[PDB]
Ligand binder design. Structure first.
Ligand SMILES: *[C@@H]1O[C@H](CO)[C@@H](O[C@@H]2O[C@H](CO)[C@@H](O[C@@H]3O[C@H](CO[C@H]4O[C@H](CO[C@H]5O[C@H](CO)[C@@H](O)[C@H](O)[C@@H]5O)[C@@H](O)[C@H](O[C@H]5O[C@H](CO)[C@@H](O)[C@H](O)[C@@H]5O)[C@@H]4O)[C@@H](O)[C@H](O[C@H]4O[C@H](CO)[C@@H](O)[C@H](O)[C@@H]4O[C@H]4O[C@H](CO)[C@@H](O)[C@H](O)[C@@H]4O[C@H]4O[C@H](CO)[C@@H](O)[C@H](O)[C@@H]4O)[C@@H]3O)[C@H](O)[C@H]2NC(C)=O)[C@H](O)[C@H]1NC(C)=O
Ligand SMILES: *[C@@H]1O[C@H](CO)[C@@H](O[C@@H]2O[C@H](CO)[C@@H](O[C@@H]3O[C@H](CO[C@H]4O[C@H](CO[C@H]5O[C@H](CO)[C@@H](O)[C@H](O)[C@@H]5O)[C@@H](O)[C@H](O[C@H]5O[C@H](CO)[C@@H](O)[C@H](O)[C@@H]5O)[C@@H]4O)[C@@H](O)[C@H](O[C@H]4O[C@H](CO)[C@@H](O)[C@H](O)[C@@H]4O[C@H]4O[C@H](CO)[C@@H](O)[C@H](O)[C@@H]4O[C@H]4O[C@H](CO)[C@@H](O)[C@H](O)[C@@H]4O)[C@@H]3O)[C@H](O)[C@H]2NC(C)=O)[C@H](O)[C@H]1NC(C)=O
Ligand SMILES: *[C@@H]1O[C@H](CO)[C@@H](O[C@@H]2O[C@H](CO)[C@@H](O[C@@H]3O[C@H](CO[C@H]4O[C@H](CO[C@H]5O[C@H](CO)[C@@H](O)[C@H](O)[C@@H]5O)[C@@H](O)[C@H](O[C@H]5O[C@H](CO)[C@@H](O)[C@H](O)[C@@H]5O)[C@@H]4O)[C@@H](O)[C@H](O[C@H]4O[C@H](CO)[C@@H](O)[C@H](O)[C@@H]4O[C@H]4O[C@H](CO)[C@@H](O)[C@H](O)[C@@H]4O[C@H]4O[C@H](CO)[C@@H](O)[C@H](O)[C@@H]4O)[C@@H]3O)[C@H](O)[C@H]2NC(C)=O)[C@H](O)[C@H]1NC(C)=O
Ligand SMILES: *[C@@H]1O[C@H](CO)[C@@H](O[C@@H]2O[C@H](CO)[C@@H](O[C@@H]3O[C@H](CO[C@H]4O[C@H](CO[C@H]5O[C@H](CO)[C@@H](O)[C@H](O)[C@@H]5O)[C@@H](O)[C@H](O[C@H]5O[C@H](CO)[C@@H](O)[C@H](O)[C@@H]5O)[C@@H]4O)[C@@H](O)[C@H](O[C@H]4O[C@H](CO)[C@@H](O)[C@H](O)[C@@H]4O[C@H]4O[C@H](CO)[C@@H](O)[C@H](O)[C@@H]4O[C@H]4O[C@H](CO)[C@@H](O)[C@H](O)[C@@H]4O)[C@@H]3O)[C@H](O)[C@H]2NC(C)=O)[C@H](O)[C@H]1NC(C)=O
Ligand SMILES: CC(=O)N[C@H]1[C@H]([C@H](O)[C@H](O)CO)OC(C(=O)O)=C(F)[C@@H]1NC(=N)N
Ligand SMILES: CC(=O)N[C@H]1[C@H]([C@H](O)[C@H](O)CO)OC(C(=O)O)=C(F)[C@@H]1NC(=N)N
Ligand SMILES: CC(=O)N[C@H]1[C@H]([C@H](O)[C@H](O)CO)OC(C(=O)O)=C(F)[C@@H]1NC(=N)N
Ligand SMILES: [Ca+2]
Ligand SMILES: [Ca+2]
Ligand SMILES: [Ca+2]
Ligand SMILES: [Ca+2]
Lengths: 388, 388, 388, 388
């Protein structure tokens, strides 16, 4: 086993095909399914798995009451087989905490969980299923990380962390890990003014992350990382196709180097694939809430402040709930190019559906096709009324 | 690991012995068993497994209400250990969709799931548990495939798909796959006038499929495929022993090159083994409904339009429900010949048993014996009244 | 991997230590535990497992009603990890039927299940988890076999079957299998007048089985088998310490070559270790019912028609239910001798406890010690009243 | 695989990071979680697992009634994946009994369970998942052992047992095992006057155990073992920071060679790391009950009868229940030093919470960091009222 290297480009994305779906809320209506949120997908060389933050109770369990809260001592990063639900009996605990990331470097897996109180959180970096490095909070304000997979190149796996205000300037750092040890870290550079929850992918020896400016931006910040030099910059997606949520209506011209204004102090984790004409952006269909989800092909979105969609695909109808969304690729598939993939978290329960006392989610995930495939929509599918 | 080659003939079939049975509806009365239908069996070189289409809910779960429907976003091909039930906790998802096939080529497994709306369905072809090829609907009318295992020879695994009307001419294609990639495809040839749900087996470098003419035929169409030349023809089973359902009474003479008339627009998936005097046909015992199941030895059924049974074996009594039935063989068993096997789906719930709001099934499977074994009957065994 | 050979003698048995216990009825009061009976234990070279006949329903399930019956289409030989309970989710199906045996030959496992109606039963012999040989009923009267493990020597695994009356002369055969194929079979020889449910062990190239004379004997028949010559004889245990159940009071003198009279048409599966002075017999404590269980050291029991106990060990109190009991050894342990082991089935429910509608069991198993260990008793431990 | 050797020293302990937490009582409110107590953690070369004594019933099960009792026939040492709960379906039985220890020697695992009545208990020593050696009670008074992992060095794995009074002099022995066989045993030596439940760790070819003087001491006895010479001594922790429970208030001066008085006939299993200035002691926060848990850095605690804390870390608040606590290390981690770890048992139910009829626990475990990490508290998290 050698470290994996990012030697391929992205396949041409002409549509999205179904990859995985776990139906966890439907099935967990009458089986021992854990309450989760903040899910993602990540591949090893011989298997791809679903990941999420457990809340340490099943959904039918009485302890599901109160699970709208983000951060407790009962949370852990869990993983489980692709498209199965996260059950008590099949879920494997990666580490303990309420913010995470995880990636395989070709030889073994690194998993990072942050736990603690808001003013005293710490990250523990696990490598080959043992704890190796720990990092203490630097700004004493909810140390937090990507909530989707990291990416490695020749052993170097950069990770984006943020510590500080959600509604003001914060202190974002890029840590470059290798075998779980810190090679280097840098403070955020470039023009992004606030960073959270970066969604990353790797192609041709470069790692691109699409993040959430929680403070001011409804355009998404982008961090581009060179994992060999161990350097980065940041900017925003130029495109007037705005992809955060909540957000104002789309203008005609976006902003490349500043937050696009109109909504403050709020947002959602999301992603994009930024590859010249082969660029696809994800977003909720609603400008106001986490409902619906679409993919739009927006040629040169990253660099063209007037780019608009040339194609699209509905993933979730606007009459169905969505949530966080994020990128991953199977870096160990055969063939000449990396096939872009993503998941969407389908959040159920509170706050939008408050007749139940819980919040949970299921997962749908697609990967790209070079065909122009017909679309379906992929909702969570559970009837909240069955839980009453 | 080399690609497997079909180098043996069928063993002499003198009776059928019990192979597997999961009792899923009985057990799922009080355990976390998934609602399924469209089951089958398929072997790898070191294990044989049960397969089916999940409905993405357990049977006791409230979401089992409505599961008579064939096609939703909550379905997936799952597999699980032989004769265990498909539970939440032991079932492995192969791919997402509501029509499937799957086979191992000696090196690894190919699995194909079709999903989408009726006018916009697509097939995703997985190989070694990754998506490799996608195929879009060509007639915009419920693209669909075998619902039982495919067969490979030297890496080439043909698969029969149909897109178009269930009650009229449709567009059937034979795709020849290798490592998940399309080597070739051909439109249906020969005299079969409508094809659905082919049940296939392989012997001496030839693949024989027994299919369902949904439009006109109560005799079954047969497709014979040369996986080296990558060519095929089709005809019908000549025999007056008619094997679709519903069907008219058996005549005295069948038809070789046309549908045998008497029932329109309906049928059920079934199979046969067509091997000269060693020929056995499966069918429901009832001409009117999916009840009962028998095997009949009908020497030269394929080519003799007056052949009648010379032996038989009851599998399921006419007072018990049956359903789809299909062929598979363990191509990696030791010994001089391939032992024919089959399963019967035992459908419970709607529409015949409408005091419950669900539809599900369990599975019974037999393989052939060179002995003349005593027969038992093998019903589903659940009491519907326990579910009330 | 070579075939295992029986090259060691029995270790000196000076007491019995606890080996395994699954508590299945206790735990299955509130978890998805299958209804079983006819359990046993058998080792592979790298693992020892519990085996039993499932009834194809959980114990809390409504289908547990009626499970006092011995033979249905819903039964299967299952195995599961040592001292775990047989659950829906962890139990592996070996084959389908309502009478079984199973043993590992050093290279792989042979499992035999008999199914069918009383007048038309057949055995299917599985080897390396595939069906290899089938055998049809020869006397049309409930073809049946050991219900505990077989034993192999250099690939040859003899198995004792009986077909015919339970209350009269029957036709017992010894089949000698190798890789699942029949090398030879012989009709029962020697002085045993009726044989059922043989409990076997192997030492120094000879296999000894202790069986149940259901028709006349309260002393147990014994079959001694030479697996190299493929020959056998039979006699009874001479000892006046009578070990079947129900049974008369112990006399002073037993019988070597005839059934010891006093009880007709009834009995229970049991076992012994017959090794000169190192001989230990198992039996229920009650002469009238399956309650209690003890081991007695009865020097030369096999050949001495006046032998009485020189030591003993209570396994289950007379105020607790027992059931079938049987022998196995770990033939792949390190060391100079084979350590004798046994299990006792602890039957709960009907017919003795008829406030519940089911019958099931749990398992306790001990192996011998060369120390003189203190004894405990090992009851099932469940409160029937919790199930009301 | 070679036997592991204790060739490293302890890493510098500057704080404790979260390692694992199973939330078993929360999750077991509505899933099939076994009732346990006396948990611990132990690593193999490729995996670390949770261990505990099952009570042979789930917590929601009616048989959980009465589980405050320590010793029944329904108990077994079980292990399960790190931070998962001990469920029916994922728990592996190591051996049967109501007192245990377990450790891996680099080649395979040794597990020891004691069972029997109080006056007739015996230990069975399993090695490579087979029983190898048995030891009978020597003082006929509840033969008992560590309840946390043992430690091996070059194949030699010493184990501390005690047989005799809990409230008076007893007979403690140190057995030195290798491949499950007794190399040697010695009676307790040095100044410790009563020993129970030793918590052990190994560094630089020496094994240190921190035990419980149940009879007189609120300071903890310490046994230091040379596994090459196979010799030991014992003394007490000198420090006036007293670490048993219940206990008097901390004095100013402790005792090195006698029990520190003030509480008789009671105590709790606990541990320490004794490494010069790098010494950390665990204890309950309450002097009166098993509530709260803290770690205190007490330089030279072992040898300095006036040492007081120079740092600390809260693990569990005084308003939350704790229980037994114990040491383990991952001896197969990479790097230059062994990272100290520990777990705390979080006992729920009786006797403190007597509105429920059961007693169970969950587990939290930490390992040391060379950083000064922020602290959180880690309670069990279940609401007893949900169980009413
Ligand atoms: C079976 O399956 C297939 C495969 O999925 C289905 O076919 C798919 O059908 C879908 C849905 O109909 C299509 O998605 C839409 O794509 C269009 C883009 O394609 C159109 O526009 C292209 C570019 O045109 C522009 O470029 C230049 C400019 O100089 C010039 O050429 C041109 O005139 C124009 O200015 C055209 O090239 C393209 O045409 C080609 O393809 C056609 C096939 O569809 C064919 O018929 C043609 O002949 C031709 O060859 C086509 O015209 C997306 O724009 C659209 O996305 C917008 O609309 C949806 C609402 O439906 C919305 O949710 C999106 O957010 C977006 O609209 C919002 O954002 C815009 C950007 O800011 C903004 O302008 C809009 O006002 C709107 O904003 C409002 O809503 C948002 C979101 O709520 C909010 O944030 C804002 O603030 C504001 O409120 C869809 O993605 C697929 O591309 C198509 N796929 C394929 C391969 O064909 C098929 O239908 C199914 N079949 C059946 C039988 O069911
Ligand atoms: C223990 O277990 C064993 C092993 O399982 C049990 O023994 C088995 O018993 C079963 C059931 O009894 C047998 O199955 C039946 O097999 C017969 C075929 O065998 C008979 O016919 C043979 C051929 O004869 C013809 O050939 C030539 C013609 O030129 C000529 O020789 C001859 O005169 C005749 O014209 C005979 O060779 C054969 O005889 C031999 O074997 C005998 C043993 O059974 C022995 O006794 C003899 O001495 C001799 O050596 C024997 O006569 C099947 O035909 C039958 O299948 C038909 O009947 C069942 C109803 O029972 C039906 O469900 C089937 O569908 C089928 O009948 C329908 O279809 C026909 C074809 O179209 C049609 O003609 C019928 O009118 C009927 O149609 C109606 O119903 C269908 C279905 O609903 C509907 O679609 C139509 O529209 C219409 O409504 C059974 O399969 C096993 O073969 C036998 N196995 C063995 C190895 O013996 C044993 O009983 C058990 N023991 C105990 C103690 O329980
Ligand atoms: C801690 O744990 C230890 C280890 O487990 C416990 O110690 C164990 O204690 C048990 C129970 O007490 C012992 O089991 C019993 O063993 C005796 C056999 O040992 C006795 O007899 C030996 C042989 O004597 C004969 O041989 C010759 C003859 O020429 C001659 O020497 C002699 O005089 C006599 O004729 C003696 O050698 C032996 O003595 C030695 O060991 C002693 C230790 O116990 C020691 O004290 C001595 O000093 C000496 O060194 C000893 O006397 C078994 O016979 C007995 O089994 C019978 O009894 C039980 C009822 O308790 C019954 O259930 C059995 O079925 C059996 O009795 C039935 O069957 C007989 C045979 O047919 C029949 O004769 C009886 O009438 C009776 O029949 C009735 O009931 C049956 C069954 O229901 C029914 O079918 C019939 O029809 C009829 O109704 C027990 O197995 C262990 O051996 C002992 N183990 C050890 C290593 O010591 C210890 O107690 C525990 N400690 C604490 C503190 O709890
Ligand atoms: C974010 O996270 C961080 C990291 O966790 C949090 O910071 C941690 O904060 C905790 C809690 O505040 C600290 O734990 C306490 O540690 C102190 C020991 O450190 C103090 O004392 C040191 C030694 O001083 C002595 O040494 C010499 C003597 O010659 C001399 O130098 C000196 O004057 C004195 O005599 C000092 O070196 C040390 O100072 C340094 O560090 C400071 C940081 O905290 C810094 O501010 C300073 O400037 C300096 O550089 C510091 O003063 C522990 O002693 C304490 O443990 C005692 O107290 C707790 C109650 O809180 C109690 O539960 C413990 O049991 C113990 O007290 C009992 O036992 C004593 C020993 O017998 C006895 O003396 C006491 O009376 C008491 O006894 C009673 O209760 C017990 C238990 O119930 C009972 O059994 C008895 O019978 C009796 O009833 C805590 O462990 C961490 O060390 C600190 N960690 C770090 C790295 O800083 C931070 O707060 C969090 N931040 C936020 C924003 O939340
Ligand atoms: C560390 C944290 O609480 N992040 C929030 C995160 C943060 O609150 C925001 O990113 C602002 O800092 O927001 C959301 C959300 O649904 O919007 C979550 F799902 C996240 N929950 C989580 N356990 N990781
Ligand atoms: C694609 C489809 O719906 N096929 C139907 C199929 C089709 O409706 C028919 O083959 C006609 O096209 O019919 C039946 C049936 O029970 O008869 C099913 F079980 C099938 N269900 C399924 N999910 N594959
Ligand atoms: C052998 C025994 O009962 N030990 C007690 C042990 C002993 O009673 C004491 O160590 C005194 O001998 O005390 C406690 C406890 O919670 O305090 C337990 F958890 C232990 N329970 C257990 N099954 N190992
Ligand atoms: Ca924002
Ligand atoms: Ca038809
Ligand atoms: Ca008898
Ligand atoms: Ca004490």
């Amino acid at each position: 086993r050698d470290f994996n290297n990012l030697t391929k480009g992205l396949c041409t994305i002409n549509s999205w095909h179904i990859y995985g779906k776990d139906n966890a809320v439907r099935i967990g209506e009458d089986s021992d399914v854990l309450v989760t949120r903040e899910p993602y997908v990540s591949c090893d060389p011989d298997e791809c798995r679903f990941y999420a933050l457990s809340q340490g109770t099943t959904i039918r369990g009485k302890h599901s009451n109160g699970t709208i809260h983000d951060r407790s001592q009962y949370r852990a990063l869990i993983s489980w087989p692709l498209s199965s639900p996260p059950t008590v009996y099949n879920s494997r605990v990666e580490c303990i905490g309420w913010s995470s990331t995880s990636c395989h470097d070709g030889k073994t897996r690194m998993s990072i969980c942050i736990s603690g109180p808001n003013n005293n959180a710490s990250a523990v970096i696990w490598y080959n299923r043992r704890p190796v490095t720990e990092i203490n909070t630097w700004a004493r304000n909810i140390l937090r990380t990507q909530e989707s997979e990291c990416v490695c190149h020749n052993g170097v796996c950069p990770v984006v962390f943020t510590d500080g205000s959600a509604t003001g300037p914060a202190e974002t750092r890029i840590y470059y890990f290798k075998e779980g040890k810190i090679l280097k870290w840098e403070p955020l550079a470039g023009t992004a003014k606030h960073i959270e929850e970066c969604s990353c992918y790797g192609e041709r020896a470069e790692i691109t992350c699409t993040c959430r400016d929680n403070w001011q931006g409804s355009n998404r910040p982008v961090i581009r990382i060179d994992p060999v030099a161990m350097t980065h910059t940041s900017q925003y997606i130029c495109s007037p196709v705005l992809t955060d949520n909540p957000r104002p209506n789309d203008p005609t011209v976006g902003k490349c180097n500043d937050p696009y204004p109109g909504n403050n102090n709020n947002g959602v984790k999301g992603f994009s694939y930024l590859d010249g004409v082969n660029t696809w952006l994800g977003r909720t269909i609603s400008i106001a809430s986490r409902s619906g989800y679409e993919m739009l092909k927006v040629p040169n979105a990253l660099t063209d402040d007037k780019s608009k969609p040339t194609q699209g695909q509905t993933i979730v109808l606007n009459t169905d709930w969505s949530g966080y969304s994020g990128s991953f690729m199977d870096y160990w598939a055969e063939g000449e190019c990396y096939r872009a993939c993503f998941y969407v978290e389908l959040i159920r329960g509170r706050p939008k559906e408050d007749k139940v006392w819980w919040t949970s989610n299921s997962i749908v995930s697609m990967c790209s096709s070079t065909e122009f495939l017909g679309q379906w929509d992929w909702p969570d599918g559970a009837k909240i009324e069955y839980f009453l």
